Amino acid sequence: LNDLYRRVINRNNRLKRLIDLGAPEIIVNNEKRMLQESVDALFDNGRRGRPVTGPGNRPLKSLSDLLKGKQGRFRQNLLGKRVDYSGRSVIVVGPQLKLHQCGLPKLMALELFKPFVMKRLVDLNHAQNIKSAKRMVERQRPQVWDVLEEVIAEHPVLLNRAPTLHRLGIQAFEPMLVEGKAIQLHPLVCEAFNADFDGDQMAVHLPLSAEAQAEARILMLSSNNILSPASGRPLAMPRLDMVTGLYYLTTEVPGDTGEYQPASGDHPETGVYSSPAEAIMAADRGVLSVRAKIKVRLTQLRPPVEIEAELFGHSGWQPGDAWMAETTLGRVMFNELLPLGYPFVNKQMHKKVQAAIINDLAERYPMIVVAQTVDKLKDAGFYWATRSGVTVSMADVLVPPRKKEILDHYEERADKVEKQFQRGALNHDERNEALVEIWKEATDEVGQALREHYPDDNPIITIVDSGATGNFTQTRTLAGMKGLVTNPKGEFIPRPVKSSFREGLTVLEYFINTHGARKGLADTALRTADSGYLTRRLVDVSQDVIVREHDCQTERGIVVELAERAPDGTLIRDPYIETSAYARTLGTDAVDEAGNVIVERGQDLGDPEIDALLAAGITQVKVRSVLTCATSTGVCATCYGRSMATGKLVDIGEAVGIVAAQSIGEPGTQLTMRDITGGLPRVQELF
């Protein structure tokens, strides 16, 4: 930049000399034009004419280029800065940690805390003065480890994982020392970061001020953020391994050892047990399987609603009362992990059911209990997943025995279409579509055959159908037939692939296959770029939507349909009710058959309320929303509705705008597509 200034000064001085000496109009005019061009280049080089070039034939960074673009001063140095007192390392799963904890290697902690540890070891007189203490730490003298354990204690730390797609990308944990160089993360928060242990690098930041430490300890604590700010579904829920372990634990297998049998005339039922403890002690022996139907006399787990209402009815104090439960021992061992007050569930623990349980638990019980229960659940899940006996082997991947007959049956139709085309019956496009349809049908048929061929206890069906991970399309591709493969333009190859990966794809089938995978990988990058830009836009527009008032008392509101009247006469719950009317404040009192009010104005409209409205037979309800909010600045608490994350009404300072925008942007990328747009471009167009 300095050189540009030199150019300006040279030309100005030469102009001054030219006016002084007395020069022809032509020369002095040209010099004036040159001065104009120099000032132009200085303020903005390259805007008019070719940019002034420097050594190496590159434009000079003009005084304005400092300000614009990604690398301008605004979006590299002002709003985004590098910061001291920070670290970074690879992450390794640690299941032994509590939800509010994270491992932190000794060297990294020592360095990060070097000021504090210096202070403590000077206070402890292990060193005479500050500089002697600094020498003490720089050589890691043996005495400086105990003091380090003293200082780190009760000092929260934030763990970011770039990119921070949403609010839960950065959470505060209580750090704990670990031996070797690797931040030991808690598994249950993996989803919140979307951080999966194959070489992700998670940065660490250290709050200092009392306000910052309070903020990290209170607002940001990992155990304080369970429910998503977007849709409120639990994000610390067990998954992958834990969910499989629990599914194995709580499922029931008829005909197992130690089952219940009510046979009489020769012996008693021989299926009942005095207490759950007895059941575990029997399971230790090779007598009772953990997945057998039995009858246990429970005296410490609350019965479900109907049994409570029958045996006790009014005020059943379960901690002492006893009741006969006909379930599996595994389900009992599960139900001990839930709080005392939660009723007995007695259901197979699909991931869906786990999510429902955690949602209800968070709605009712205080958050700390939710954290403790989730952690116990993780422990049991890992243990029983280890015992679950889920492993993959070629022998466990069973191809369908009817595959060849279906292949012949559908290849016959394919040959028929080939013959019809060879006689000119139809053009290339028509026969391509005909083959596409025939082979898609074949696809569905072999998929059905494979599904019905598998038993239920197979490792692959067990993992997929428990909700743990993966979808049946992947299973069908694994055994059976992969299917139609995408043309690199995007169309469907009418070949198609007819081979299972277990059977092993042929050379040409593989070559055809590569098109789709390469295109998918390419499509990921541009789409995440556009998603990031969209999020930037939405954030800026909503950078000033924050709560200001509790209530504006505005009569205005919107109407939401809820259930639609059936033609036969019935209320079927509208499918998309969980994202429309939930977590909303009623604008007007509900009315039933011109009767009393089921739920009057100003109620959160949580699950019982919607159930009551559906039962009573009302569909349209007027709810308050941000749209019809009377308050000029920002919005009010009531009109906005319930905070999805906190589970209660919003505070008077929440920046709901940023939360909104980030929640819109977060499902980017995972928002895929299959001319009117229908993907992320369509969203962009709408906004």
Binding site: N2, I9, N12, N13, L15, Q36, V39, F43, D44, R47
Partner: protein, 106 residues
């Protein structure tokens, strides 16, 4: 310096009067630093007489060199003896022989 009294921020066109009011001098030579002794030139693009002393608390020639001479200007070289960091604060200005038009508005 600066305080929390930032209640309002204003931007506007800067007239030549304002520009020469900001400036602590008027650079009139295209000389950065001496090739040999590696020091700023007089009236150059790094002139110590304008933007302050390179190393804090002494004038160019060195007549005054310590803190008690704070806010004093040495007669020999004219350097105001103060903190060096002010070099990030003080501006110059070039008095153009002929008027020029700012590109942004063109």
């Amino acid at each position: 310096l600066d305080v929390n009294f930032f209640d309002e921020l204003r931007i506007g066109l800067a007239t030549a009067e304002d520009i020469r009011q900001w400036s602590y001098g008027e650079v009139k030579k295209p000389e950065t630093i001496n090739y040999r002794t590696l020091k700023p030139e007089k009236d150059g693009l790094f002139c110590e007489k304008i933007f302050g002393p390179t190393r804090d608390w002494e004038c160019y020639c060195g007549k005054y060199k310590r803190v008690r001479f704070k806010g004093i200007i040495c007669e020999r070289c004219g350097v105001e003896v103060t903190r060096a960091k002010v070099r990030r604060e003080r501006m110059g200005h070039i008095e153009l022989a002929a008027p020029v038009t700012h590109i942004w508005y063109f």
